[PDB]
Design a protein around this ligand. Structure first.
Ligand SMILES: NCCCCCCNS(=O)(=O)c1cccc2c(Cl)cccc12
Ligand SMILES: NCCCCCCNS(=O)(=O)c1cccc2c(Cl)cccc12
Ligand SMILES: [Ca+2]
Ligand SMILES: [Ca+2]
Ligand SMILES: [Ca+2]
Ligand SMILES: [Ca+2]
Length: 148
């Protein structure tokens, strides 16, 4: 069905090196500490150890390369891809940001051959903006069009 590409593994390899900040090869609680404090978090060495227990299937207090890739190579996120929401995002995203804005929608309805006033477009993006609000993304379009 789908063909995996070495590109994915390279992605997990870039994040791995970004975490280890001491040339070690293994991610400890100290290195990870600076990994969460340099991004946007201020937890502690104790709570951190707890977040490491789930990323440790041996009992060593650290993570290796086969555990970091086997954990993030499975799921990590959710990006449904169907022939329906695929063409839709391809026609609503002509700038590149990869997001549908109330403005673009206005220029898309007039091109197809219809006539919607700014009031109709803004109200539309609002009914589909359940988690974005102000902007829409892939997931939103997949959960706004399909619904029992
Ligand atoms: N979670 C968003 C902020 C960080 C983004 C980069 C890291 N992304 S992550 O949160 O998936 C992640 C990466 C590497 C080690 C982790 C350990 Cl030891 C525990 C929990 C998550 C970990
Ligand atoms: N290959 C299948 C393509 C299916 C396209 C369906 C388009 N369905 S739609 O015209 O109702 C529509 C288009 C673009 C954005 C929308 C937002 Cl943000 C909210 C509500 C409706 C939206
Ligand atoms: Ca190290
Ligand atoms: Ca381990
Ligand atoms: Ca766009
Ligand atoms: Ca939204």
């Amino acid at each position: 069905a789908d063909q995996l590409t070495e590109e994915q593994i390279a992605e997990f390899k870039e994040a791995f090196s970004l975490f280890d900040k001491d040339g070690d090869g293994t991610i400890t609680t100290k290195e990870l500490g600076t990994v969460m404090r340099s991004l946007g978090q201020n937890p502690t060495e104790a709570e951190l150890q707890d977040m490491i227990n789930e990323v440790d299937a041996d009992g060593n207090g650290t993570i290796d390369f086969p555990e970091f890739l086997t954990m993030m190579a499975r799921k990590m996120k959710d990006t449904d891809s169907e022939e329906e929401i695929r063409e839709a995002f391809r026609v609503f995203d002509k700038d590149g940001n990869g997001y549908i804005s109330a403005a673009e929608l206005r220029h898309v309805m007039t091109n197809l051959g219809e006539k919607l006033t700014d009031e109709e477009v803004d109200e539309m993006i609002r009914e589909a903006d359940i988690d974005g609000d102000g902007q829409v993304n892939y997931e939103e379009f997949v959960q706004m069009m399909t619904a029992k």
